[PDB]
Copies of this chain bind each other. A is one copy, B any other.
Amino acid sequence: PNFAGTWKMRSSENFDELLKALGVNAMLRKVAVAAASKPHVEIRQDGDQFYIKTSTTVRTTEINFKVGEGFEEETVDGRKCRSLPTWENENKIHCTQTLLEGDGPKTYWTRELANDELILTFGADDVVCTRIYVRE
């Protein structure tokens, strides 16, 4: 299969740590780590084109991009950045991030479909956060 479908999170790891790497203070980190486990992701994949919805029942964050062409979004902690997606290999998109406002930790994310699970990985320098998604 491809990345298309509805995904529910199975497990998260080192997320709080990543947020610290990105400078989010203890309290905000805490509200942030909590709110991250509630949404369900819905991916629409069409070739290199993606449309991802990270929703709930009263909220929804939507974004589209095309693998192979830069686009703009926001780093996990809410900073503005230009992103560059490329296919590392058939089952894995790698995306480099470069901040627009200011200078800080090198951010990056990758999405990989392995064993029918979606493994999202966040990088904030030497810190790496990982989360696994299972088809709902």
Instruction: Please give the residue numbers on chain A whose beta carbons come within 8 Å of chain B beta carbons, in ascending order.
Output: 24-28, 30-32, 34-35, 57-59, 74, 77-79
Contacts and interface: CB of A to CB of B under 8 A. Distances in A.
Given A25-B79, A79-B25, A58 B31 contact: yes
Number of copies: 2
A78 B34 contact: no
B32 A78 contact: no
Contacts of A77: 25, 27-28
Contact of A59 (B30, B57, B58, B79): B30
Contacts of A26: 78
Contact of A35 (B24, B35, B79): B35
Which of A24, A26, A78: most chain B Cβ within 10 A?
A78
